[PDB]
Amino acid sequence: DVDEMLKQVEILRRLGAKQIAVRSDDWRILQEALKKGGDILIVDDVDEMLKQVEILRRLGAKQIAVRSDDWRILQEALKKGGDILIVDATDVDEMLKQVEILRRLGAKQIAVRSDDWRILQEALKKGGDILIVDATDVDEMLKQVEILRRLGAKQIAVRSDDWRILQEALKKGGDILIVDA
């Protein structure tokens, strides 16, 4: 969706978003995001993921993110030049373990994704850098963003396939807006 992603990135920039992330499986879509000024490129198969990280690295992308529920894959991504490691969280204790492991591998930017703000709060307490609210309902999203902010979160991302939710997240003060491509 080079056209439809370009649209959302441009509108979000006009609405005042300072950090826009684009997720896609096609490195050329991410390349188009990079040339458009997208801030974070999210690489959405392990060999294919590693090849995309190398391509984006050599294109000059400064913030390459990789998502996995397997810390071993995130470790491989870090060694090949990934910047932001996104821990896909569904159990609090497994999430806390992965954050510990990746920090000790030298990861300087660890993100945790969940639709449960309580998991995100546990990641915040543990030192997770970016909390990704996985949003389905606009009012639920708004309450989670406020809770995490008041609990001290300083980088809150919102991901949604609903454009209406991304717009409202930005209005509410969400720090990073994640566009699907």
Residues in contact with Cl ion, counted by CB under 5 A, come to a total of 2
Nearest distance from C-beta of residue 38 to Cl ion, angstroms: 14
Length of the chain: 181
> Distance between CA atoms of 156 and 175, rounded to whole angstroms?
5
- How is 156-174 classified by DSSP, letter by letter? EEEE-S-HHHHHHHHHHT-
Nearest distance from C-beta of residue 134 to Cl ion, angstroms: 7
Nearest distance from C-beta of residue 136 to Cl ion, angstroms: 14
CB 165 within 8 A of CB 135: yes
Shorter beta-carbon distance to Cl ion: residue 14 or 124: 124
Nearest distance from C-beta of residue 88 to Cl ion, angstroms: 8
Structure tokens at 128: 């997770």
Structure tokens at 150: 């008041």
Shorter beta-carbon distance to Cl ion: residue 113 or 175: 113
String of contacts with Cl ion for each residue 147-166, x by CB under 5 A: ------------x-------
String of contacts with Cl ion for each residue 100-119, x by CB under 5 A: -------------x------
**Residues linked to residue 159 through DSSP beta bridges, in sequence order:** 134, 178
Give the number of C-alpha atoms closer than 13 A to the C-alpha of residue 133, restricted to the C-beta side: 31
Provide the binding-site residues for Cl ion, judged by CB under 5 A.
Answer: 113, 159
